[PDB]
Amino acid sequence: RSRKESYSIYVYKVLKQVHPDTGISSKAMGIMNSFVNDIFERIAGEASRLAHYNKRSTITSREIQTAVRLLLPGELAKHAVSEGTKAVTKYTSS
């Protein structure tokens, strides 16, 4: 009863979504949780840093938009911004 608050069941849900018939070890849960945390703090630091660059006190879709164009190289950037754009479009229409 310490409330570690990891992301193990959520990445478990997405892997059972994409690969329905494969199990996975807890070591890979540790690797993936460290990956999501490390990538998240990287891109969030870049987004806040870019918001400070433009004397802007907020982070919106435009700042994280430019920041994911920055950090993800090449075609990962364009595929990620396409899926993020359709995700925020579907959430906007609700």
Partner 1 sequence: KVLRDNIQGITKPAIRRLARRGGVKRISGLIYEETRGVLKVFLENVIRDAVTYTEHAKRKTVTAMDVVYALKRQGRTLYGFG
Partner 2 sequence: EVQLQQSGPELVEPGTSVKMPCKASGYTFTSYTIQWVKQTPRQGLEWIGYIYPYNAGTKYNEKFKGKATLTSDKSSSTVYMELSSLTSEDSAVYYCARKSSRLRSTLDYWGQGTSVTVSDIKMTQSPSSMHASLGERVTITCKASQDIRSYLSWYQQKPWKSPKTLIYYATSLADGVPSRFSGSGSGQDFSLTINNLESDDTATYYCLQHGESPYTFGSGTKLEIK
Partner 3 sequence: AKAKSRSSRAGLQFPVGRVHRLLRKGNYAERVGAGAPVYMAAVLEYLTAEILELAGNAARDNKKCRIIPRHLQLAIRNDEELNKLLGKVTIAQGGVLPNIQAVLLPKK
Partner DNA sequence: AAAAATAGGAACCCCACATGCCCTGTGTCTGCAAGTACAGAACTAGCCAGACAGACTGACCTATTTTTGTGAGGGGAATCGGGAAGTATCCATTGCTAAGACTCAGCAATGCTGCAACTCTCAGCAACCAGCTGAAGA
Partner DNA sequence: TCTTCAGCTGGTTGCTGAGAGTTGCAGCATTGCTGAGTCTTAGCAATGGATACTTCCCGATTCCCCTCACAAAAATAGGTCAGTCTGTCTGGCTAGTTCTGTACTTGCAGACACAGGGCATGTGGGGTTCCTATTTTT
Distance separating alpha carbons of residues 39 and 33, to the nearest angstrom = 10
The answer to whether 82 contacts partner 2 (rule: CB under 8 A) is: yes
Q: Which is nearer to partner 3, 4 or 27 (CB)?
A: 27
Closest of 35, 38, 43 to residue 66, by C-alpha: 43
The answer to whether 8 contacts DNA (rule: CB under 7 A) is: yes
Is residue 42 within 8 A of residue 71, CB to CB? The reply is yes
Binding site for partner 1 (CB under 8 A): 27, 30-31, 33-35, 38, 46, 50, 53-54, 62-63, 66, 69-70
Binding site for DNA (CB under 7 A): 1-6, 8-10, 23-24, 55-58, 60
